Design a protein around this ligand. Structure first.
Ligand SMILES: *[C@@H]1O[C@H](CO)[C@@H](O)[C@H](O)[C@H]1NC(C)=O
Ligand SMILES: [Ca+2]
Lengths: 49, 49
């Protein structure tokens, strides 16, 4: 597959970039579930995924 | 109500137990009017006498 006719990498077509391990998804009012924020986890809490 | 995310309380203040409204961080020092402070100053005055 030549993606745009010349490239070789799968394009990124997500509304928001994936949140990191230390962060968690946060909603944005008026936007669908595919669009979220990357609010950091509070102290005493962790996230591995 | 229906708050998407919790907002940061000002620096001088701190949130209460229900996280509804945040109040000022309690000042703290050995007050002259405090019972311990008044007892210590009474002891010092009696000793000076
Ligand atoms: C929660 O605690 C705060 C403390 O200031 C106060 O608003 C009240 O006692 C409790 N209830 C609500 C609904 O805030
Ligand atoms: Ca909308």
């Amino acid at each position: 597959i030549l993606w745009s006719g010349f490239s070789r990498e799968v394009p990124f077509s997500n509304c928001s970039r994936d949140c990191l391990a230390g962060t968690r998804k946060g909603i944005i009012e008026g936007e669908p579930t595919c669009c979220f924020e990357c609010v950091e986890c509070p102290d005493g809490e962790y996230s591995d995924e | 109500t229906d708050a998407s995310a919790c907002n940061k309380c000002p620096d001088d203040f701190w949130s209460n137990e229900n996280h509804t409204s945040c109040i000022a961080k309690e000042i703290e020092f050995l007050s002259w009017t405090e019972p311990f402070g008044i007892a210590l100053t009474l002891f010092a005055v009696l000793g000076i006498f």
